Amino acid sequence: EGLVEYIDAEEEESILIAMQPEDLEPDVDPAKRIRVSHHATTFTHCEIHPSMILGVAASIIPFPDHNQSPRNTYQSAMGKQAMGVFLTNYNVRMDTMANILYYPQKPLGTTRAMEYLKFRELPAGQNAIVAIACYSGY
Amino acid sequence: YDRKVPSPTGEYVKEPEWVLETDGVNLSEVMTVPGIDPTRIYTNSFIDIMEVLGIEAGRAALYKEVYNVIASDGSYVNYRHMALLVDVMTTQGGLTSVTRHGFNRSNTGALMRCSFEETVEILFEAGASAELDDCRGVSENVILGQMAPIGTGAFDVMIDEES
Amino acid sequence: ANWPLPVNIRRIIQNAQQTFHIDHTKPSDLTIKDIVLGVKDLQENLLVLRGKNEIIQNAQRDAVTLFCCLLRSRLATRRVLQEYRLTKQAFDWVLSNIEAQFLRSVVHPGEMVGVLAAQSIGEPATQMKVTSGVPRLKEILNVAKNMKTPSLTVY
Amino acid sequence: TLSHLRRTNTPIAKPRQLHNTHWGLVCPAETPEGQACGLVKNL
Amino acid sequence: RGNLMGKRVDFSARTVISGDPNLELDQVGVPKSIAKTLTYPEVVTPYNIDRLTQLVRNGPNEHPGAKYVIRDSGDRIDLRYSKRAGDIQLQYGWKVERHIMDNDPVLFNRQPSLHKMSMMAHRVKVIPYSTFRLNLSVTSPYNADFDGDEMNLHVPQSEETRAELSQLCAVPLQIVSPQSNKPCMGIVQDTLCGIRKLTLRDTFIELDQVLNMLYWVPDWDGVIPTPAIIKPKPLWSGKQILSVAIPNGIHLQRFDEGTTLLSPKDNGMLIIDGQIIFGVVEKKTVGSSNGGLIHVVTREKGPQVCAKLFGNIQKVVNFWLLHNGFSTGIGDTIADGPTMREITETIAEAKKKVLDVTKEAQANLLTAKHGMTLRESFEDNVVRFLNEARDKAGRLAEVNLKDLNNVKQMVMAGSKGSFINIAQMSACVGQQSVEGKRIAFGFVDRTLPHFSKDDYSPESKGFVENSYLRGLTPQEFFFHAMGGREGLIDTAVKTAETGYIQRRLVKALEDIMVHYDNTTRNSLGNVIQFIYGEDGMDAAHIEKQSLDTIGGSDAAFEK
Amino acid sequence: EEGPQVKIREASKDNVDFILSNVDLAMANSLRRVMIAEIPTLAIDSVEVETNTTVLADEFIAHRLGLIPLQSMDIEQLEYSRDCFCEDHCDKCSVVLTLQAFGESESTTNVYSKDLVIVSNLMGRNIGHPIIQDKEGNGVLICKLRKGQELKLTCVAKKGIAKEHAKWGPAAAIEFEYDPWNKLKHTDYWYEQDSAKEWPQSKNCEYEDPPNEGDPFDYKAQADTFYMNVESVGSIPVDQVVVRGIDTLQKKVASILLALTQMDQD
Amino acid sequence: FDMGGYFIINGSEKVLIAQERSAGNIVQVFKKAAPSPISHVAEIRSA
Amino acid sequence: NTLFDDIFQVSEVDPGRYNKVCRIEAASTTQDQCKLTLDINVELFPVAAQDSLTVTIASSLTRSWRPPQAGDRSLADDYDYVMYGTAYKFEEVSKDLIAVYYSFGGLLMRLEGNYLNNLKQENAYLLIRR
Amino acid sequence: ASRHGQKGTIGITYRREDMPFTAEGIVPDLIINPHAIPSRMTVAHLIECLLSKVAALSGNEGDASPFTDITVEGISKLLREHGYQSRGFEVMYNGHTGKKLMAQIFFGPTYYQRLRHMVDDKIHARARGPMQVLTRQPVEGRSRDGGLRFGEMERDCMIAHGAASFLKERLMEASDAFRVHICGICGLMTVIAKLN
């Protein structure tokens, strides 16, 4: 119906993308982040949602925009090393080695992208009542 | 540039002078220009210092450069180490690189030099020129599996009847 | 002025005015000969090289020149008798202790300091408008015919 | 599994740096560390 | 290179490492199984025949025990399978391969071995669980954390070689390193933050806690020090009870900034006769600095006393911190309202300055600096302005922080953190840069498809007004991702080239040593230095002293 | 009585909220510790699985089986299996209870704790019966069976301490708070602006008097009044939890005293 | 939950990693080095 | 016996980023050439502005510190605020002005006077009343 | 590891008695050191802790999506509404003594994940074992019960120390050692040593 297009980088070279769909409309909270006003007009395309710039592994990171980038990278690398339920039929497959978490849990802090990655159905970790403190020094 | 200068009263006082930095190097002709101090002129190219002023000035410039690279990161290494490096680079007569083209072309033992970079060709040419090995190189006794004459093995232990 | 030197003198002095519990309101039982000739003879025992020929002796005095400068600067008659007011016993103790600590500070023969130097240079390099750091160090060690930033500093 | 099934390999000026054109096509965060950094990428 | 210069060896082990606040500096926590596996041959002598008989009687699987028994003929008796593992008469001259036991000298190593401090001799203390355990003051010369780090251990197989380990490669002997003529070990992390929190003038300790801390010191004389406060309540100070860890005859003096023998801000450091007179103790003192306390105690009392000092300080400080507590929350990264406002308006006036300079440059009114392009001068100006902006907002953020701010406390202690962390977390993370320059134009005359062509504005070329507390925008996030990416890349490249350069350096000055005439030579006898280091002094026994003859006026000199 | 005092504020089958007066901090804290760990309780220690064609693994089920709360009223007149002279376990130290389940209907056949059947002889001792605080009367859900899935096993419950395993925990979370007004100043409050407005006000503030600003710091004061709330899992009643706690602490103190008595032997 | 997109060889699940390459039939001009005799090179990979 | 005794007038109180210890600045109400700076534990003995504290230096009232028992043994004080420190510096401003530096577990003190029997010794009992 | 590149191994394990405890009686399932925060700048860890706490209490699912207008201030407000410190702090008591702690502890739910690597899968030790066939040196790998390679850098370290005897021991008695016969004329391994 001509509502959405498929754009590669070469064609992306000659377009103007709006970051948010609210950047087409013509006192504030100090808490929120500082966002530069749209000084553009001739938009041809608009972004679906910026969070789509990430990959599958990076979409599991809570508030990745509040972290130093190499930390997001490290988490992206270590997420593939976490234990959980990799398949529902794990008890009928003869894999060389498979680890399945005893009691998986869907994280209290989720991403809207986690919905499509089936992470809340097949999680890889538990919510630990954590404490940041200096105790025994161990 | 700011600079500490001995005041006629005694104490060192900051006396700021004007110094000309330069992109481009040709020490052979710049120092002979009437107008500047021809005894304080310096280049970051120690290779030119070695050619123009001599091998000792080249040593000082080399140490200055290495020290500058080390201290550039705020670090600090004691003098004797860097000095040892620069000296072993400059004792041959010129600027001996720290590569297979530099010190590995020396007159040391065949095994020692063959234990680094080019191995087979070294053993070949050494086997062709009939070279004698002193076996007082560390890596050589390492190969031979002997107590190398280094540190604890730099001396011999014997007995003398004093009982 | 601040430079790495073998024996620390300050700690020895402040240890001297603690070991003997000297009061700063009492005339020292020293002599001009005691201090002057004492230090002058102290400089004789700071042996780094132990040869008998002239060459080795010259190399010796050249090797102990700086530390002797520090020694004379710190153990001046005025400074000894007024700055901390040392006694005879305390002074002899200071001299002997300085000698001993100096003889301890000598490098031990057999010390593989080549590898030690190479490691002492290579290790901090891992923790790293002209070119500096690892590429510049690479240039220096390779003796680059063409350096990325040739500069001429003219005074 | 999801991550491995959507992987990009690169053989051999600055092929390791995150290029601007990678916006929305390649993940800016997910890449192996140590050796094949920037070369191996994920969609 | 693979079989002669370095070959695989027996009597070796490797495991995941962890810290233990109750282990000595020269000790190593060794798992029981490793203690059962690794073995040492011990000749049967009248001095130890009983103990050896007991160990053989225990055999393997039970520590302490033995693995094999070698006779005179050379026959090897495998205890775990032999029919006579219960009845053995140990003859004099026989060897007994026993399990590794306590106080055994072993070589501890962590790759990459960059210097001699990467291989140090430790005393074995066999413990349960499967982790190599080490002190928190040996972590630095090894350069090791506990996020999965593994280390290797080698066992000597004769008396002379374990002597070589215990008399040369010992950890206390490696405290003062000849690399930077300074101690390479010190108090860090919780012990540092704790020793900072303890020596405060507000920190007072009542009777019971004082008694416990005192008893926690192994070298405690058993003499209760007279409390700084008598009436109304007998209270001690952190300094006063910390002094118990410091040996007698220790004199430390260091003036920092406005230190006038009274110290209104309680800075500097004065310690007399093993008793701290005044000054908050932190990294400048208890750390691994040149004139640090560790250096002093090491060169004065000895390496053993200094290691035991590490022990005492650690035990006491960790004990006090255990019952005091210390944390870190997001609240420690939150500046006041007006502070955040001043930060915002600072960034605003910065971007305004950039706007003025840009508009000036576009009108061809800009004058190029001598030796560089108009464009280069512009870039330099904008970059410098944004840097001054991040620094301004950063200092504005640091000033606002209280003394009770945990992050600021860790910064003060020197435990972990710095100014830039405060700046980026609370104020502004600043400008992103790749290859020394700001984010260039991947697309034609623009960095992203979300900008118009030719947009040299800060928020375009990769400037981030937002802090980590507020959150980054998509563009800011991507630019930051580019920068970080380059970080990882040049990191890998750096460790590669540094590794190679290090190898070359070592292979170059391999056979260089000092002979018995203080002459630095090589395998050819070629003199490098007639006198090593041009003075003949070892780098370890050297301290930076002031030559007060070279400075001052001639009048003051004469006076 | 004569020493410490107790003022019960709330009481139920699961919880007891009270105030402990005239006591040293160490005694209260140690009492908390004993209540948490060193109280004897009966729990599943052994599991003999005959047939297991369910989804869950063997020891996976054995785990939650062990974690099931059992009656531990007369646990004191039971004996440790390590103390009993019998082989393995008997009826004077252990309580054996079988478990047999099998999918029957097309729907999912649930397996709870009510399906556990006491087999061994209790001989008049109130013990072994799995606590069911459930409304429907099912209890802790062990697992779920399909249609043809079967689960046949037999558990052996032994006397143990929560210091050995958390499955022998007679209590859940013990609430503990002293000096709600920080008049002893054992805590230096963190803040950004106001230290009082940011930190909420405790419930136990109503029982004590607010500090007057016209008063200096009371340095001679100690920790006397404590506010506790003990919660029981169900195995042992709350009153019996705290009573057995006190009696346990007292018992081991008395054991140390007895050791002191024994060390006087020639 | 298995998304597929792989093969099975001898019981082993195999995945074909997408191989990145330069686009063919593209005209690109490159500036050559300084010691090089040629200054610019206009090349195209014909497919 | 006693080493020093005088009545001072508190002229300044300074809580330099502290909340339990305030540095005090007082002057002698007898000698116009005498002054005193002294860190005080306010949480125990509060010292407001414009107060007149009675200050005393003593040598006694080494061995370990036994339990108080003030109502059983010889306390030799009945003051309000007592401390124990160590002299570490004897500075001489002029011939008519001599200053001494005591350290009470970190709580420092500078006493400037003229006429003294204050020798470098561990013995330093500072007693303050009213 | 958490979900922010904050990895680390278990140093030790404490029972609930020794563990610190809040006034509610809640004990931390895990204790991490504060020092692993400022030098790494993982603010989103703390933020996800706060959010997970609020979402836990309120019984909802906290939205931790990347680019949203969810700020620490609103989350703090919500947490304060539930009767807790808005910045995630909690007054805790030292489990050993029961005495309060001066500083309050950042306490709350955080999603952690047990990573791949475990100690018992990494631990290795060999007194002596199977050698290779070609070079007669200790075999390679843990799964083959092999020995650790005494690398060139290790050799360099032992040289730096001066322990020559230890170097020889590591290069003879530890690894491979051979007795060979040499002719006194040509000096090669031509000797046909007929022993016995």
Added chain:
Amino acid sequence: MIVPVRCFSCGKVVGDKWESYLNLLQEDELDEGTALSRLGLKRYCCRRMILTHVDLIEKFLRYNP
């Protein structure tokens, strides 16, 4: 897998509350918060134990073996 028998943090039994939780959710049509509140799960750790859990045994029972 299946609902954990007891809470990790403290140790309160939470295994008998799962079905009742689901009943409070879909039958009485309440939010997760109130449902967890009626089940006597005051502490947010016990609350977490049920709120965070995903019943995966239901998908496991789909297979025929």
Added chain:
Amino acid sequence: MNAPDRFELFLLGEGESKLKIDPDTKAPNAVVITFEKEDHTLGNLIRAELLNDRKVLFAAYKVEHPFFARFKLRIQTTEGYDPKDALKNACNSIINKLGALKTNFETEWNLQTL
């Protein structure tokens, strides 16, 4: 794999006694007692109760390592006062306080509802 048994935290080993009283060589009339198979639960209590005795000069306890459930307890009293007597009296004090506390809680519980 290398983990010690759980009962090793409250069950005494082979040849291990409960208390190990040793003469403190540091200060005169002092004693260091080694408590086996016990933790802070008993140590903190005993130590805190030893401070109540005004004839006790010193009293401190410590767990030298959390791996092993044992703690050392140093006690120092006045001359003519054997420290073991102080320990015993402290213990009996604890016992009496706990007994009275138990009686009080029971009598209080006998007056409650629900």
Added chain:
Amino acid sequence: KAIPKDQRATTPYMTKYERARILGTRALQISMNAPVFVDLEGETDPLRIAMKELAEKKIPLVIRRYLPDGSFEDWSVEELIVDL
């Protein structure tokens, strides 16, 4: 050839390598049940016994210090100074 007992230029102080070597060799001898020339006084560890035997200068060994030219100087353990 050799170097006479007079005009010896090498350090009279025993180097750390010399001390470690002597202690090592002596500890080896003791480890192979050799006659001890000092009172054990409770010591049974061959290394410690070697150390105590070093402090009393009851070690009948000698040190041959090589010179880079080929010459050598002899220094008995009894004559050498142990200041470390």
Added chain:
RNA sequence: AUGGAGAGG
């Protein structure tokens, strides 16, 4: 054994 993939500091 050769060769290859991925991962850990």
